[PDB]
Amino acid sequence: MHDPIPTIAFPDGRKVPALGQGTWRMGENRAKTADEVRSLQTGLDLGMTLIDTAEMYGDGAAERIVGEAIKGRRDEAFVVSKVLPSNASRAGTVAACERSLRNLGIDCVDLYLLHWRGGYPLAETVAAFEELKKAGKIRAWGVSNFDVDDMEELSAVPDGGNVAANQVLYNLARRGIEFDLLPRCRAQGVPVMAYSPLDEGRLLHDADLIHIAKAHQATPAQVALAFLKTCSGVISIPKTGSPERARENRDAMDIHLTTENLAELDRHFPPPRRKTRLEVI
Numbered sequence: 006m007h008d009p010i011p012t013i014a015f016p017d018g019r020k021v022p023a024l025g026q027g028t029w030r031m032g033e034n035r036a037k038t039a040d041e042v043r044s045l046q047t048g049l050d051l052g053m054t055l056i057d058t059a060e061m062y063g064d065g066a067a068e069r070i071v072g073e074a075i076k077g078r079r080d081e082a083f084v085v086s087k088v089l090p091s092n093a094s095r096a097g098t099v100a101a102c103e104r105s106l107r108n109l110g111i112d113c114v115d116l117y118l119l120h121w122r123g124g125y126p127l128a129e130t131v132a133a134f135e136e137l138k139k140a141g142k143i144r145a146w147g148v149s150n151f152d153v154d155d156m157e158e159l160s161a162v163p164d165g166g167n168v169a170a171n172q173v174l175y176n177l178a179r180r181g182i183e184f185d186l187l188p189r190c191r192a193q194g195v196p197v198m199a200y201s202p203l204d205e206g207r208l209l210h211d212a213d214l215i216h217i218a219k220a221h222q223a224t225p226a227q228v229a230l231a232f233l234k235t236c237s238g239v240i241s242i243p244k245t246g247s248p249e250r251a252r253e254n255r256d257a258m259d260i261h262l263t264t265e266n267l268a269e270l271d272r273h274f275p276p277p278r279r280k281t282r283l284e285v286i
């Protein structure tokens with residue numbers, strides 16, 4: 006038996022499970038499509054109800070994978086997509102959202118993010134997001150790859166206080182946000198979505214992670230996700246094209262990391278002692 010996945014609250018009061026699902030690199034190989042769809046469906050069945058995608062991912066292909074996975078069960082998914090900054094003018098953002106809705110085969114996305122900071126005024130992107138919300142095409146908007154200075158600029162734009170999430174790189178190998186951005190977002194009540202929670206697989210070769218996983222009869226990936234489960238105000242979004250790995254990732258939530266485990270992880274993956282440049286992928 007599994008314990009329920011912990012939930013994370015958005016500023017609007019909506020709650021989502023702390024473990025979701027990613028889709029970057031899905032939709033590239035026709036031989037993998039069926040299993041990518043099955044992976045997302047399996048995750049939905051197991052309570053990993055947030056699914057993260059973007060217009061960038063295969064230029065609509067990953068969105069179409071998500072659209073297939075949610076057929077006949079839209080209400081059970083919390084769908085996140087994104088607008089590229091090169092499209093984030095007011096008219097551009099509306100057009101991007103319409104393309105995303107068509108690829109996803111849905112009326113409304115749950116959360117719509119600015120993918121990173123670009124050249125169009127933030128006030129204009131936010132105005133588009135608010136228009137889309139009033140139109141019933143998105144339920145909430147947020148940002149991604151926003152450092153502390155980028156977050157500060159939201160207070161200078163109308164409706165900037167409505168930001169629902171900041172999706173940034175966060176995993177055991179990439180802990181920089183702990184010094185500043187993560188405490189700020191927690192204090193604002195803005196969830197951090199931890200992208201690349203396995204560091205795209207790179208973290209899984211770490212000696213200490215392998216050591217701790219062995220002690221729990223678990224995998225390194227499960228320990229990496231279990232670490233993020235201990236971080237309040239964080240939603241992790243691991244990606245896998247394998248339904249077997251979707252099941253494994255769900256089971257990461259059953260790991261009980263000890264006080265000693267957490268101290269050991271901090272020795273091997275040192276938290277930041279000073280402000281550091283936001284790491285991105």
Ligand SMILES: NC(=O)C1=CN([C@@H]2O[C@H](COP(=O)(O)OP(=O)(O)OC[C@H]3O[C@@H](n4cnc5c(N)ncnc54)[C@H](OP(=O)(O)O)[C@@H]3O)[C@@H](O)[C@H]2O)C=CC1
Nearest residue numbers: 027028029057200201202203204205206226243244245246
């Ligand atoms: N906002 C942004 O700028 C960004 C957003 N993202 C989002 O975050 C999501 C997750 O990050 P992502 O970059 O995909 O990388 P992840 O850290 O989620 O790692 C994905 C890799 O790990 C493998 N994998 C998954 N589960 C396991 C497991 N249990 N054991 C071993 N290997 C495993 C996958 O292989 P396989 O699929 O073959 O199983 C894949 O190669 C993205 O898919 C995207 O939705 C990511 C980067 C940037």
